[PDB]
Symmetry: C3
Subunit: 82 residues, 3 copies
């Protein structure tokens, strides 16, 4: 997956491989993600680090130009569930 700081896949970005227990700990991505591309698999997003406080919406492959539309504000962590 790829996270983007701004909507419509703009701004600084961050590559996710299988999972990230602490998205906010990356110094090169000092931003809350505002859009997302899922390349393969189905993913669960979490408000907090270490896979706590999951969002209800799960994300299969696709382009998500404004994840705030899905209720997503902060992504503390995320992982492939299938």
């Amino acid at each position: 997956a790829v996270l983007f700081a701004d909507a419509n896949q703009r701004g600084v970005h961050k590559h996710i491989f299988e999972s990230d227990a602490d998205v906010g700990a990356d110094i090169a991505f000092n931003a809350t993600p505002r859009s997302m591309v899922v390349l393969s698999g189905v993913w669960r997003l979490y408000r907090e680090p270490n896979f706590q406080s999951p969002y209800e919406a799960e994300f299969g492959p696709g382009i998500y130009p404004s994840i705030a539309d899905y209720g997503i504000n902060v992504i503390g962590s995320m992982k492939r569930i299938s």
Copy 2:
């Protein structure tokens, strides 16, 4: 596709998924692209935002270390056509 600020796939880079109607709206990519990698599909590049004023050259998968050679100095938008 991937755009790069410098020739030969160096400098800040920008990932394009399917299309970008406004490359220049990306503040994190404050540069004219000078090289490009196409990973899949064939792409059309445009001088202006919103898929207007296309360049004639179309780009299939490959590594393009100096897109100025193709007469491309600014990319206002781009999209996968196949």
Copy 3:
């Protein structure tokens, strides 16, 4: 392949396509890499530019959260050998 400035796939990153005879030539990759993801192919890493002074370790697809564990500090160049 993807090079990361920080361990555990964090920090500024750099995409490698088939090979790079001079990794250090990239002004935007302002650091010695500490982790790497190989997406496809098997890669040889070198201490010097232009594929001189190879490391003995060869890297197939996978996630390598600390390449120092493999005795790798500087990557002057790298290329696929398959």
